[PDB]
Amino acid sequence: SEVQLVESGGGLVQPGGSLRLSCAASGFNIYSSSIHWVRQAPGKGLEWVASISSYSGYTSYADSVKGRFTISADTSKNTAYLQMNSLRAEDTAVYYCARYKYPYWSWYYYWGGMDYWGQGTLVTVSSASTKGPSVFPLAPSSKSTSGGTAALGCLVKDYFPEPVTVSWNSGALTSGVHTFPAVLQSSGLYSLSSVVTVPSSSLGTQTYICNVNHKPSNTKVDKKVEPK
Amino acid sequence: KIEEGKLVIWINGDKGYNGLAEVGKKFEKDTGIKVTVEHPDKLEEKFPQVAATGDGPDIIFWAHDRFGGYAQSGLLAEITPDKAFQDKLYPFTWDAVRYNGKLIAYPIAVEALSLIYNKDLLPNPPKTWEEIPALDKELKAKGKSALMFNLQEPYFTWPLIAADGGYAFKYENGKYDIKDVGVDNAGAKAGLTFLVDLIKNKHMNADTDYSIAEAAFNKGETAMTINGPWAWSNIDTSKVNYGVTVLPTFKGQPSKPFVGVLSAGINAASPNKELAKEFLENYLLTDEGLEAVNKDKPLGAVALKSYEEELAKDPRIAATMENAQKGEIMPNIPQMSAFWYAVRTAVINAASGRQTVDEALKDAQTN
Amino acid sequence: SDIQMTQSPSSLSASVGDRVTITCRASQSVSSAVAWYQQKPGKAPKLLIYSASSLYSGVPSRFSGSRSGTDFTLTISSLQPEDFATYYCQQYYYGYPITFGQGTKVEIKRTVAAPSVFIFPPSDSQLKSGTASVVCLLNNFYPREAKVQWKVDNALQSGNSQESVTEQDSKDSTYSLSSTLTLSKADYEKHKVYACEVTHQGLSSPVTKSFNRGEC
Ligand SMILES: OC[C@H]1O[C@H](O[C@H]2[C@H](O)[C@@H](O)[C@@H](O)O[C@@H]2CO)[C@H](O)[C@@H](O)[C@@H]1O
Ligand SMILES: [Cl-]
Ligand SMILES: [Cl-]
Ligand SMILES: [Cl-]
């Protein structure tokens, strides 16, 4: 609650480009602690990247980032940094910063693990340019009606990069909504679908609009969905 | 940084800190500077943890084995006592506090575990570990037990593990080699296997700790226990008729306990190095100071020569040194902290049946 | 400087109130320098256990860690709704780099439920661009394993569709599946019948939803 970490600096860059991440700390002092960087690609496990310990003058790097990444700390403003050079497409992941409570010494390794984590920031390394999505409606028909329940949605096709956010009626509709994880098509573009189940009788009175926001491309689309 | 004009001291709770607090009172009546004595839990671990935040005491009290880690981490100040003062203490006690050719704390007293027995329940204590199982079943028929001691700390079981070969780091050329660890050799496996058998055959209890063992012996419920000189005061108030003698042998070889030298170090971040140096040398390390602490909880064989000549005449002190002569002085290298972590974990896992002896001692990785 | 962390099982189903045990194994001796974490979808990890068995402050006492031979174990004595997530182990012995396990999924167990199947033809706007996408929807089923097949004029399609599955619903513990079949507008207008065939444990026979192109 009082101890927290806020990250910043992610984005999309070309292979060979550079990025600099930040990890700002509150509720404790970085000079008397240790900061770690851990990354997670979509739908996979966790992988440690780098570590720094100010009070003991200690730094360490994973083999898969040696000679490319640099970790550092600014004690005067309680912030740690991760300079990432020579980025590859396989570096695409969510990057976290975590705290180790005490300074690090090899003979004191047994003091525990990582107790506080930041929210994370997304890093995408690609040669493709940003592209906004096309929003197509999935109109409720007789083919999408089982009993008193009917289904409808929109299709968010051909955008890059991740992510997108989707809501229904500006957030006023939450019950029965399913937004599916995006898939990477063979064209190198993403595609997503979001649906909502509603009573069939309500197709006459209630209005249904899906709100799509793709901030990487500054794309905002409000699409009304109605029966064919 | 700690406040200027006052001395904060950390010492373990099982020692006579109230006696040390009185020594600090005589210091303030002469200098006008208050001395506070505290006994935080796991203080040997909290000191390097809180050092970066500016907290911690001005003087730290612990056995010498953990002072090399404090020095390598840059947390201690080098002490500078003149040649005349160094002659007042035994030469070997200065060696225990020498790290990389420098003195990093003041030695106080020598500690070693002994065998404590109830003279009424046991006129002749056993000489071997092997006959203890047979003695327990005979005492259980009377509502008593043979032996209870703190199984939660490897300090108390190490004498049996090292009896027939176990060791920490190989010493050679006047130096310790951290790549030569002797925790899982044939002798160490034999010692720990014998301990685990005692628990399996219901002669001991894997959950026994310091308080349970101390209460059982002082209340006449168990015949034997293993502890240090500090525990003698509590046995006196319980009026139990007890003795202090050599530990029993294992497979014909004597028990080899780790000998500790209680030491006092000075914080490097303290602005009171001036006063702390004078307090230790001319108020605690005297006949008056050491006696005020010793009469609270016994310190053992003190490093000050002009007091050991008196304490040596105590048979309990002679028994402490005979166990010490059969053991070895602990190393002071920084790796000793990781050593105690691995050994503490292996003993508890084996004693509770979660791992075998071969698995636990192989799992103890300290290098 | 090499080590591998392997967890078992990779997935398990349990009920609220059950006792659960996960195991973790390392390829090298590391004493008890292993920690356990919890992570839910869309959230950062959370520390539960360190030093194999030391409970971190705030973690309920129904969690516990222990050793079983050389293996590390994590046990939840009375499973609660908030306990359903993914759990990782991690070693931090100074002789090897910090390494995590592959994770272990703990899902809610319920009775089998067959999915509702829906199908959507391409929209007018998309066809104006030259493409046709067909969507098949499987709503609220259990367990997760399902099978979808696209048929166009009774011919099985392969290599031209993709699908994705949601997380387990927090209210009824079911799953949902969305599948999209994409073709060019020229190929879409050559055929008549577009169908998505579904097979699932909750169905005694495969279910087919289809439509004829231009059938309003
Ligand atoms: O059990 C591991 C522990 O052993 C020693 O600690 C002793 C200490 O030296 C004695 O003065 C007394 O307090 O008993 C302690 C064991 O409970 C080592 O000095 C210590 O570093 C180690 O952790
Ligand atoms: Cl727009
Ligand atoms: Cl021997
Ligand atoms: Cl436990």
PDB file of C-alpha atoms in Angstrom, chain C residues 23-126:
ATOM      1  CA  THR C  23       5.740 -29.797  -6.336  1.00  0.00           C
ATOM      2  CA  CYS C  24       8.894 -28.149  -7.685  1.00  0.00           C
ATOM      3  CA  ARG C  25      12.247 -29.721  -8.522  1.00  0.00           C
ATOM      4  CA  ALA C  26      15.637 -28.168  -9.262  1.00  0.00           C
ATOM      5  CA  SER C  27      18.433 -29.792 -11.249  1.00  0.00           C
ATOM      6  CA  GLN C  28      21.089 -28.758  -8.697  1.00  0.00           C
ATOM      7  CA  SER C  29      21.386 -28.581  -4.925  1.00  0.00           C
ATOM      8  CA  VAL C  30      20.466 -25.101  -3.688  1.00  0.00           C
ATOM      9  CA  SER C  31      19.737 -25.729   0.028  1.00  0.00           C
ATOM     10  CA  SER C  32      16.280 -24.213   0.779  1.00  0.00           C
ATOM     11  CA  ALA C  33      16.733 -21.017  -1.269  1.00  0.00           C
ATOM     12  CA  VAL C  34      13.413 -21.371  -3.094  1.00  0.00           C
ATOM     13  CA  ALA C  35      10.408 -19.031  -3.082  1.00  0.00           C
ATOM     14  CA  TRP C  36       6.807 -19.363  -4.269  1.00  0.00           C
ATOM     15  CA  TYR C  37       4.737 -16.693  -6.023  1.00  0.00           C
ATOM     16  CA  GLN C  38       1.101 -16.212  -7.036  1.00  0.00           C
ATOM     17  CA  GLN C  39      -0.088 -14.468 -10.198  1.00  0.00           C
ATOM     18  CA  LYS C  40      -3.550 -13.821 -11.652  1.00  0.00           C
ATOM     19  CA  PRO C  41      -4.226 -12.794 -15.280  1.00  0.00           C
ATOM     20  CA  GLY C  42      -3.468  -9.117 -15.806  1.00  0.00           C
ATOM     21  CA  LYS C  43      -1.642  -8.679 -12.482  1.00  0.00           C
ATOM     22  CA  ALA C  44       1.946  -8.703 -11.256  1.00  0.00           C
ATOM     23  CA  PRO C  45       3.317 -11.582  -9.156  1.00  0.00           C
ATOM     24  CA  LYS C  46       2.899 -11.720  -5.380  1.00  0.00           C
ATOM     25  CA  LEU C  47       5.336 -13.296  -2.911  1.00  0.00           C
ATOM     26  CA  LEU C  48       3.887 -16.070  -0.716  1.00  0.00           C
ATOM     27  CA  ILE C  49       6.706 -18.271   0.646  1.00  0.00           C
ATOM     28  CA  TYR C  50      10.465 -17.834   0.892  1.00  0.00           C
ATOM     29  CA  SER C  51      13.229 -20.076   2.245  1.00  0.00           C
ATOM     30  CA  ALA C  52      11.044 -23.063   1.272  1.00  0.00           C
ATOM     31  CA  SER C  53       8.753 -22.703   4.298  1.00  0.00           C
ATOM     32  CA  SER C  54       8.814 -19.138   5.703  1.00  0.00           C
ATOM     33  CA  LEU C  55       5.411 -17.472   5.314  1.00  0.00           C
ATOM     34  CA  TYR C  56       5.495 -13.847   4.162  1.00  0.00           C
ATOM     35  CA  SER C  57       3.530 -11.346   6.233  1.00  0.00           C
ATOM     36  CA  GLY C  58      -0.115 -11.075   5.232  1.00  0.00           C
ATOM     37  CA  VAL C  59      -0.275 -14.503   3.571  1.00  0.00           C
ATOM     38  CA  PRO C  60      -3.007 -16.632   5.216  1.00  0.00           C
ATOM     39  CA  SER C  61      -1.811 -19.568   7.312  1.00  0.00           C
ATOM     40  CA  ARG C  62      -3.657 -22.025   5.045  1.00  0.00           C
ATOM     41  CA  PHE C  63      -0.561 -21.755   2.821  1.00  0.00           C
ATOM     42  CA  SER C  64       2.510 -23.749   3.816  1.00  0.00           C
ATOM     43  CA  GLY C  65       5.769 -24.936   2.303  1.00  0.00           C
ATOM     44  CA  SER C  66       7.870 -27.995   3.019  1.00  0.00           C
ATOM     45  CA  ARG C  67      10.359 -30.483   1.562  1.00  0.00           C
ATOM     46  CA  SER C  68       9.697 -33.967   0.174  1.00  0.00           C
ATOM     47  CA  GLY C  69      13.022 -35.616  -0.555  1.00  0.00           C
ATOM     48  CA  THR C  70      14.860 -33.218  -2.847  1.00  0.00           C
ATOM     49  CA  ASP C  71      11.563 -31.712  -4.031  1.00  0.00           C
ATOM     50  CA  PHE C  72       9.935 -28.483  -2.866  1.00  0.00           C
ATOM     51  CA  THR C  73       6.210 -28.550  -2.064  1.00  0.00           C
ATOM     52  CA  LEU C  74       3.463 -25.943  -1.673  1.00  0.00           C
ATOM     53  CA  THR C  75       0.209 -26.837   0.086  1.00  0.00           C
ATOM     54  CA  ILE C  76      -3.124 -25.026   0.478  1.00  0.00           C
ATOM     55  CA  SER C  77      -4.979 -26.735   3.321  1.00  0.00           C
ATOM     56  CA  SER C  78      -8.415 -25.179   2.637  1.00  0.00           C
ATOM     57  CA  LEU C  79      -8.744 -23.730  -0.855  1.00  0.00           C
ATOM     58  CA  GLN C  80     -10.628 -20.415  -1.101  1.00  0.00           C
ATOM     59  CA  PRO C  81     -12.075 -18.617  -4.171  1.00  0.00           C
ATOM     60  CA  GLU C  82      -9.235 -16.079  -4.110  1.00  0.00           C
ATOM     61  CA  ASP C  83      -6.643 -18.902  -4.172  1.00  0.00           C
ATOM     62  CA  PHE C  84      -7.348 -19.902  -7.803  1.00  0.00           C
ATOM     63  CA  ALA C  85      -4.407 -18.731  -9.927  1.00  0.00           C
ATOM     64  CA  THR C  86      -0.985 -19.713 -11.307  1.00  0.00           C
ATOM     65  CA  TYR C  87       1.902 -20.545  -8.955  1.00  0.00           C
ATOM     66  CA  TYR C  88       5.640 -20.356  -9.688  1.00  0.00           C
ATOM     67  CA  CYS C  89       8.743 -21.493  -7.830  1.00  0.00           C
ATOM     68  CA  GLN C  90      12.039 -19.620  -7.968  1.00  0.00           C
ATOM     69  CA  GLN C  91      15.569 -20.380  -6.793  1.00  0.00           C
ATOM     70  CA  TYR C  92      18.016 -17.733  -5.575  1.00  0.00           C
ATOM     71  CA  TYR C  93      21.128 -19.608  -4.438  1.00  0.00           C
ATOM     72  CA  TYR C  94      24.041 -17.301  -5.267  1.00  0.00           C
ATOM     73  CA  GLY C  95      25.804 -20.014  -7.315  1.00  0.00           C
ATOM     74  CA  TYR C  96      23.148 -19.989 -10.060  1.00  0.00           C
ATOM     75  CA  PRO C  97      21.172 -17.219 -11.770  1.00  0.00           C
ATOM     76  CA  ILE C  98      17.652 -16.471 -10.599  1.00  0.00           C
ATOM     77  CA  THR C  99      15.455 -19.037 -12.356  1.00  0.00           C
ATOM     78  CA  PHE C 100      11.685 -19.595 -12.294  1.00  0.00           C
ATOM     79  CA  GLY C 101       9.627 -22.706 -12.911  1.00  0.00           C
ATOM     80  CA  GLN C 102       7.191 -23.074 -15.794  1.00  0.00           C
ATOM     81  CA  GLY C 103       4.207 -22.448 -13.520  1.00  0.00           C
ATOM     82  CA  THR C 104       1.232 -24.464 -12.293  1.00  0.00           C
ATOM     83  CA  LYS C 105      -2.412 -23.658 -13.059  1.00  0.00           C
ATOM     84  CA  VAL C 106      -5.109 -24.190 -10.412  1.00  0.00           C
ATOM     85  CA  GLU C 107      -8.618 -24.090 -11.908  1.00  0.00           C
ATOM     86  CA  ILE C 108     -12.085 -24.411 -10.388  1.00  0.00           C
ATOM     87  CA  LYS C 109     -13.767 -27.803 -10.784  1.00  0.00           C
ATOM     88  CA  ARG C 110     -17.457 -27.938 -11.688  1.00  0.00           C
ATOM     89  CA  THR C 111     -19.848 -30.309 -13.421  1.00  0.00           C
ATOM     90  CA  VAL C 112     -19.696 -30.777 -17.190  1.00  0.00           C
ATOM     91  CA  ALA C 113     -21.566 -28.147 -19.219  1.00  0.00           C
ATOM     92  CA  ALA C 114     -22.138 -28.203 -22.969  1.00  0.00           C
ATOM     93  CA  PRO C 115     -21.552 -25.021 -24.994  1.00  0.00           C
ATOM     94  CA  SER C 116     -24.048 -22.879 -26.825  1.00  0.00           C
ATOM     95  CA  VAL C 117     -22.895 -22.554 -30.438  1.00  0.00           C
ATOM     96  CA  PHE C 118     -23.478 -19.441 -32.552  1.00  0.00           C
ATOM     97  CA  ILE C 119     -22.242 -18.434 -36.007  1.00  0.00           C
ATOM     98  CA  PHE C 120     -21.943 -15.018 -37.677  1.00  0.00           C
ATOM     99  CA  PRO C 121     -21.609 -14.322 -41.425  1.00  0.00           C
ATOM    100  CA  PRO C 122     -19.311 -11.552 -42.712  1.00  0.00           C
ATOM    101  CA  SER C 123     -20.534  -7.979 -42.388  1.00  0.00           C
ATOM    102  CA  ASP C 124     -21.378  -5.644 -45.262  1.00  0.00           C
ATOM    103  CA  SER C 125     -18.512  -3.284 -44.424  1.00  0.00           C
ATOM    104  CA  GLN C 126     -15.844  -6.002 -44.537  1.00  0.00           C
TER     105      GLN C 126
END
